Amino acid sequence: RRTLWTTPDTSPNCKMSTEKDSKLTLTLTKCGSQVLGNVSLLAVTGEYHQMTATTKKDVKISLLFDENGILLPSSSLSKDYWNYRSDDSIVSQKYNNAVPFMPNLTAYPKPSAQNAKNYSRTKIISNVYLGALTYQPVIITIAFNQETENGCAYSITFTFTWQKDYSAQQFDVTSFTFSYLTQE
Amino acid sequence: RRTLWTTPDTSPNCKMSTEKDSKLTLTLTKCGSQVLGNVSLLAVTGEYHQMTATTKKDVKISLLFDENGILLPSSSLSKDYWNYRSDDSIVSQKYNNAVPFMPNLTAYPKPSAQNAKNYSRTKIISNVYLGALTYQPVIITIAFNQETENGCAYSITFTFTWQKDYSAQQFDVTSFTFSYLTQE
Amino acid sequence: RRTLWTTPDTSPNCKMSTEKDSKLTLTLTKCGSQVLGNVSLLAVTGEYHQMTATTKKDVKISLLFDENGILLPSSSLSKDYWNYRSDDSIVSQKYNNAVPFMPNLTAYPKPSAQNAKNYSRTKIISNVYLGALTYQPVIITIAFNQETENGCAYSITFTFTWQKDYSAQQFDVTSFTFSYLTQE
Structure with missing residues (x-):
């Protein structure tokens, strides 16, 4: 089937600062x-749930994949509810190939001398908005296949970077649509 | 079939200020x-056709849907040429289910205590450009399922908000692409 | 089949300043x-490979198509590896109809009195980023069917316009996703 996702609930699945402090909502x-x-x-909890003036204004979420397109456990995102769509949940089989969802290695080659x-072209850069407030831009950088750690074959990372003072606020951003060329 | 649209003509179908003063071009x-x-x-006519210094720089277009995904008459958009694509027009049957086009209620829950x-994540915020002029940004805010009025089951709204002085100009904006998670 | 592309390699296919000085990566x-x-x-070479203070900060890439949706030789893009996807290359047949990929002429009418x-709505305007550096915006303007030269039936142009001083840098921009309504 044709969608990989996190599920659309708000149950924590991701590390911004500490384990399972955040919900990454991602649909491919x-x-x-x-x-x-x-x-x-x-x-949802932790540092980014109530930012201070010193909370780092740069957060990278890394999805690392093996050569089958399967998420590696060293990723920022938990494997547990990252899988093919079934209704508003995921399918029961844990380890299905996902190479056709992976970023194309010719378009987006790994780092090397x-x-x-x-x-x-390996990156997409735009703005999303903190709290869905129009005066609170956050730069989103999406990068394809630019990680090498832990033996990954492919990668998608989402970095959020900002300069404005969002202390006392809960980190939450508007949704962002994008596309990328795939492997087969 | 797989597209709902307004048709790509310029015949007025929408209320910015007064009834049928505008063409919303929308394709899903x-x-x-x-x-x-x-x-x-x-x-096309009315206040926004030739703005003044006092014309409100904030315009919300509301599409309200029933539980079948069918547009409610209290919407800003007229029902008359909002339907499934047939060539450059719409199909003749008026009341076909469209739940698979509706915004997912788990991703985008209704407002409530x-x-x-x-x-x-219920919103997308970006810029479009008035008159397709690069120095004339207009913020577009797309919101999913954030309306409750008139018994609606789902909603998509498009708000255009700006601060620059566009008096004497005709409101018209560049096209904007987006996506959202669906109900089934 | 369902994708037209340039191929995802870096072999020059396009004119920014001089022939075959650049790679346009385009997938439809x-x-x-x-x-x-x-x-x-x-x-890849030429003026834009190492910009000076006087290199023009406005570059238009024109794709002109005939009534079959086939790229005209007067385009900025070379015909040679612009075709339907086959693996990471193109199919061997050179002249396949592509009207279903062309921009809709009712949505996006040609220029005329x-x-x-x-x-x-004939344009999309947003920012991409030079060198994938967040402080280096470049305006991208995509225009549909706004060319008339050389008898073209349809057109897609990509203009890159900026004001910041990017002298000494190599022109390269982040990827941009968009959509448009099609002819059939």
């Missing part, structure tokens, strides 16, 4: 040569 | 777990 | 009534 829908992606992030440059 | 294409959406708005917070 | 995936598009641009206005 296969549309032939592209995945149509939709992402947002909410801090062999590369002529750091290719900018 | 079902891509499995997500709808791929594309929207723009044009004022039962909610732990106002969840930011 | 048919999703019913819409195409899901993904674009980026890299200067017959038009009531220049319709803003």
Whole structure:
């Protein structure tokens, strides 16, 4: 089937600062040569749930995948409810291949001295909005296959970076739609 | 079938200020777990057709749906040419179910005291450009299931908000692409 | 089949300043009534490969199509590896119809005195980022069917416009996702 997701609930599944302090809402829908992606992030507990003036204004969420397209346990996202869509939950089989959802390695090559440059097309950069307030931009950077750690074959990372003072607020951002070229 | 739309003509179908003063161009294409959406708005007559310094720089277009996914008459958009695509028009049958196009109620829950917070993932916020001029940003806010009026089961609203002085101009904005998680 | 693309390699295929000085990475995936598009641009040689203070901060890439949806040779993009996807390359047949990928002429009409206005929905305007650096915005303007030259039936153009001083840098931008309504 054609969607991988986190499920649309708010049960923590992700690490911003500490384990399971946040809900990453992520849906990847296969549309032939592209995945149509939709992402947002909410801090449920911990530092980012009530930011201070010193909370770091740069948060990277890493999804690392093996050569079958299966999420590695060293990822920021828990494997437990990351799987193919079944109703508003996931399917019962834990380890189904997902190479057709992975970012294309020719479009988005791994980091290496062999590369002529750091290719900018490996990233998407835009703004989302903290608290859905229009005066509170947060830069979202989505990067494809730019991780090498833990033997990963593919990667998708979501970085949130900002400069405005959002102390006393709960980290939560508007949803962001994107696409990327796939492997097969 | 797989697209709901307004039709791509310029015949007024929407209220910005007064009835049928504007054309909302909206296309919703079902891509499995997500709808791929594309929207723009044009004022054809009335206040927004030739703005003054006092015309309100905040315009909300509300699409309210019943539990079958069918547009309610209290919406800003007229029901008349909102339907499934047939060529560059719509199909002749007026009342076909559209639940698979509706925004997912777990991802995007209705407003209630039962909610732990106002969840930011219920909105998309970005900029479009008035007159397709790069120095004339307009904030677009798309909100999912955040209306309760008139017994609606689901909602999609498009708000356009700005601060720059666009007096003497005709309200018209660039197109905006987005996606959202669906109900089934 | 359902994707037209440039191929995801970095072999020059496009003119920014001089012939074949750049790689346009473009993928168009048919999703019913819409195409899901993904674009980026890299200067490989020539002026934009190492910009000066006087290099023009406005670059238009024009894709002109005939009535079959086939790219015209007067386009900025070379015909040679613009075709339907086959693995990470293109199919061997050179001249397959692509009308279902073309921008809808009712949504996006050609320029004419017959038009009531220049319709803003014919464009998408947003920011991408030079070098994938968050402080280096570049405006991307995508325009549909706004060219008339060389007898074209349809057009898609990508303009990159900026004001910041990016001298000494190599032109390269983050990827951008978009959609548009199609002809059939």
